[PDB]
Amino acid sequence: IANQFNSAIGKIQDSLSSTASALGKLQDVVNQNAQALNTLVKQLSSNFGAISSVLNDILSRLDPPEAEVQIDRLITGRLQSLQTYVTQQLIRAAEIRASANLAATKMSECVLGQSKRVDFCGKGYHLMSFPQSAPHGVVFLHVTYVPAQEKNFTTAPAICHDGKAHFPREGVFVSNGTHWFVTQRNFYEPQIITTDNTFVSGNCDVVIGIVNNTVYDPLQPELDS
Amino acid sequence: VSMTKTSVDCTMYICGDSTECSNLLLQYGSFCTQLNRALTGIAVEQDKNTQEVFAQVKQIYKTPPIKDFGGFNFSQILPDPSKPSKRSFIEDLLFNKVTDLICAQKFNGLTVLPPLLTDEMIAQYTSALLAGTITSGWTFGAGAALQIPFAMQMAYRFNGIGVTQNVLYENQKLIANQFNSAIGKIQDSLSSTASALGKLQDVVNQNAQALNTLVKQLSSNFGAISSVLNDILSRLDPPEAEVQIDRLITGRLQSLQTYVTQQLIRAAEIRASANLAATKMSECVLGQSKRVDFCGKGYHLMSFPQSAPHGVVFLHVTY
Amino acid sequence: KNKCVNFNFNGLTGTGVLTESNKKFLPFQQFGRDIADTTDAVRDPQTLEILDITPCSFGGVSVITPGTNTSNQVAVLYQGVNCTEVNVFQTRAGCLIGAEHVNNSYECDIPIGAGICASYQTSQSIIAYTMSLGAENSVAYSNNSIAIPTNFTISVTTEILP
């Protein structure tokens, strides 16, 4: 676990160093603001139907009563430009506040504690998350437990010994074709079938597919010894 | 999930087939060029909602030729190859119960862009996710696919809700009649009752009233003598027509911006439900969550996703 | 007829394609109107007939090209219209000129529409293909069969939020 994990950090460093587009989500924030600001600035150069876009030019040419007509066009148009900018910024404000709340949620579930949610902290069984600061945002490094290799085994729903069906207390029943073992679902760790690893429920005439075997009772040899 | 994609052209819409009228649009700057990017961004977001929800995996999982479910009948939710388009029996009713109109608006300058993800490929998403959950249980999305007997899959699902797995093996015979009968009631409710799909119908009608009203603005004079550009151009002088054209463009700009503003607001509401649809896929469908009444009333066990036009339908199994 | 023209009929000036219409307008009826109150059809004052008005200038223009450092090859895509002006192919999105059609399915690179995507590949040129949904994985299923992982790996996922 120390070799796989430590080797993973090296892959994150190489990935982040080589790939500059992984942060594009943050670059889009800077680009969006740059485009919105650049646009808002370039609208001042437009005449908005007026003879000229410069106010002093209108005042230095048209008479007082005539200049008001042209200035009204500039104001009316420039006011609408702010309405478009403010409106757009309020929309983007709803998009960033949604992501910010999501980040705060992940820090609570993924970072501070351990979350059992499915694919919320990333693929696999969530172990823990380490936050990292990024410009106008945050980065989350999610350590997870992903099973690698798998092998196919024979299973049975229950074991029949004394006439009463035996069920696993934890794990599942597995066999290679000879003896029946009880093991966890996340890994293969052979364990003998015992009264301590199973419990008695129902009978052997109910469970469909029940198999016969001998359930090892630790108390038998203790009484013999 | 997905909202109808509509791309409006402020160059053709504002001034129809008019060179002089269009000349006045340049004086307004990016107002036309700006509104084009606002609508384009909404069309791009429509494709990201279907990719982050419909398909949660990079592989396709198909059912085996010999299907043994342990006494349960999945034929209703399983895809039928006999049909020309592969879909589940439940998805067939959704397509019919959810409804030229576009020809009239398409010629006005409003173009409806087709979705990057066809409804045919969307149906195969639910077929892979629904097929992986049955054969692979809940472990197909968390890593390599685990082959597990479906009879033993529900045994643990009862353990997470506080019920010993011993009740499933013994009572699994009676669960076949309760589970199969529950699926049949859904098919009869959607076919007989058409009001259950009103949630998605309100989304289509929301855009319909916005498109038809936007086209009706051209008939309004907006303070101008007439609402037709050729009528004012052939009557009033170029300088006088510009005064009337100013009221036409100014009136149409306020109507065009009002439509774009509503689309951005409606798009935000759709994205809010998109995250929920993507959240229900992993927690309800893909995995199992101890949270109560998120997947529907009762202890959650398994969820079966179903494709629907401009949306998605979820079938949740509760205890 | 069957061509885009600029027509003046009974004082009504407009541009559109003139075609014979199957609609029968009453004698007192001169020009028809659609839901949008645009002219639906026209009637020639000389020889009385009903002509369907189909507007002109349909479809968009889009450019499909790889990065500049890749190559200067371009593929013109006309969306919402078939092939008119004019490697000339047609899709549900519209006429696509400048891109070859490869029946083999690959991973979507440059999205087009209707499940079709484009990429620059092998003497290399822009090719069009159906979006691949991923490799088919058939999980063997049997009542007595189970799969227990024999190995594990620790993975680190990088997620970013603004």
Author numbering:
A (entry chain A): 923 to 1147
B (entry chain D): 729 to 827, 848 to 1067
C (entry chain A): 535 to 620, 641 to 676, 689 to 728
Pull verbatim passages from the article behind this deposition.
The S protein is also the primary target of the humoral immune response during infection. A large number of SARS-CoV-2 neutralizing monoclonal antibodies bind S protein, especially its receptor-binding domain (RBD), providing a basis for vaccine development.
Four cryo-EM maps of the Kappa S trimer engaged with ACE2, including Kappa S-ACE2-C1 (only RBD-1 up), S-ACE2-C2a (RBD-1 and RBD-2 up), S-ACE2-C2b (RBD-1 and RBD-3 up), and S-ACE2-C3 (all three RBDs up), were determined at 4.0-, 3.9-, 3.9-, and 3.9-Å resolution, respectively. Noteworthy, for the Kappa variant, ACE2 binding induces a more pronounced S-trimer population shift than that seen in the WT S-ACE2 system, suggesting that the Kappa S-ACE2 complex is prone to transforming to the more open C2a/C2b (51.7% population) and the fully open C3 (34.1%) states. In the S-ACE2-C2a, -C2b, and -C3 maps for both the Beta and the Kappa variants, the up RBD-2 or RBD-3 appear also to associate with ACE2 if we lower the map rendering threshold, indicating a dynamic on/off of ACE2 association with these RBDs, in line with our BLI data showing relatively rapid disassociation kinetics between ACE2 and the S trimers (koff = 1.00 × 10−2 s−1/9.34 × 10−3 s−1 for the Beta and Kappa S trimer, respectively). In the meanwhile, RBD-2 swings away from the center and RBD-3 swings in towards RBD-2. This motion presents conformational transitions between Kappa S-ACE2-C2a and -C2b states with RBD-1-ACE2 in the up position, and RBD-2 or -3 tilting up alternatively. In contrast, for Kappa and Beta S-ACE2 complexes, they all present pronounced population shift, i.e., with only 14.1% or 8.3% population in the one RBD-up C1 state while the remaining dominant population existing in the more RBM exposed C2a/C2b and C3 states with two or three RBDs up and possibly engaged with more ACE2s.
